[PDB]
Amino acid sequence: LTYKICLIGDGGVGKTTYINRVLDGRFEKNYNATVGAVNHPVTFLDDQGNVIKFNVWDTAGQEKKAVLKDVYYIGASGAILFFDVTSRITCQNLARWVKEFQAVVGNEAPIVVCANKIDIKISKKLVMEVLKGKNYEYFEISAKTAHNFGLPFLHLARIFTGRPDLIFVSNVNLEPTEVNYDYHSP
């Protein structure tokens, strides 16, 4: 079962730190220069023996100075939207990120919100107000230490399969790739 997922959120919030791990393997990843994105395949086996593959797109840093192309979003089944709990700007732009994603994919596709860098803070209240009170499934994570790495994917698999009791029975390779694919940004 295969789903495209977009990572979104301001530059510096930890998107690349989160995803840029070995996962299904370095060689399996792909780069698309037209879009400015790397695909990271991550496969989990569930409790009923289904193979669930997420093709998780990450930017090469262009969000720092520019708007992402529609092709980044097109075909996505879901998004993981990050902010940095130590920076209010990143929280403020959450509604803008949601609108940008939904403007291409529509309002049904699940968006999971991750409060990142909880290891280092912006209250969840501020998130709720920036987002006009709309509910999104919400996790506190540390992309650095991989704390709670699986939770957004577990939620997404449940939505997509319709099985609220779906669990992952395989463990993912969480080693950092040591591959820097980011464009230099002065």
Interface size with Mg ion, residues (CB under 5 A): 2
60 is in an annotated binding site: no
65 is in an annotated binding site: no
Residue 16 touches ligand GDP, criterion: CB under 6 A: yes
Residue 174 binds ligand GDP (CB under 6 A)? no
Place of tokens 């695909």: 39
| Numbers of helices and strands, H then E, in the chain | 6, 7
* Residue 117 annotated as part of some ligand binding site: yes
The gap between the terminal CA atoms of the chain, to the nearest Å, is 40
Residue 14: name its binding partner from ligand GDP, Mg ion, none (Cβ under 5 to 8 Å by kind): ligand GDP
- Which of Mg ion, ligand GDP, none does residue 119 bind to, with CB < 5 to 8 Å depending on kind? ligand GDP
Binding status of residue 90 toward Mg ion by CB under 5 A: no
Q: Where are the beta strands (DSSP E) in 78-121?
A: 78-84, 111-116
Find out whether 132 is annotated in a ligand binding site.
Answer: no
Query: What is the size of the binding site for ligand GDP (CB under 6 A)?
Result: 15
Q: Choose, by CB under 6 A, the member of 4, 6, 14, 29 that binds ligand GDP.
A: 14
Listing from the earlier edge strand, what are the strands of the sheet with 137-140? 30-32, 37-45, 51-59, 2-8, 78-84, 111-116, 137-140
